[PDB]
């Protein structure tokens, strides 16, 4: 429960459509996950750019002080 709350607020901390991308790529707060091509169709930009978005978001969250609170969930 704590993890879902924290991940939701930290996603809220990031940009809008990137956040929606990351929610859709996974099952975060949503049902079955669609593969990259289908989400790209969802934005109508359907290609490697979507994984470019994924990698850029991951890179952007790599920076500490935001994820360390979530780092705690590792053990």
């Amino acid at each position: 429960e704590s993890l879902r709350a924290a991940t939701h607020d930290v996603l809220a901390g990031l940009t809008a459509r990137e956040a929606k991308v990351l929610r859709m790529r996974f099952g975060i707060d949503m049902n079955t996950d669609y593969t990259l091509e289908e989400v790209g169709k969802q934005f109508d930009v359907t290609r490697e750019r979507i994984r470019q978005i994924e990698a850029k978001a991951l890179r952007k969250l790599r920076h500490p002080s935001r994820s360390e609170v979530l780092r705690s969930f590792l053990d």
Partner: protein, 50 residues
């Protein structure tokens, strides 16, 4: 556990071992630890109790 007298008590109280106190109130302890921020998350609270 086994009971013992301990006369100095007030009528409305009872002597309770620490270690049982931790064992019983574990979740209350976790709650307070997380509220005051002494522990970042529940898992760290558990390690801090142990």
């Amino acid at each position: 556990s086994v009971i013992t007298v301990g006369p100095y008590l007030r009528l409305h109280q009872c002597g309770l071992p620490k270690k049982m106190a931790l064992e019983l109130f574990k979740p209350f302890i976790y709650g307070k630890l997380e509220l005051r921020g002494l522990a970042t998350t529940i898992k760290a609270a558990k390690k801090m109790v142990e």
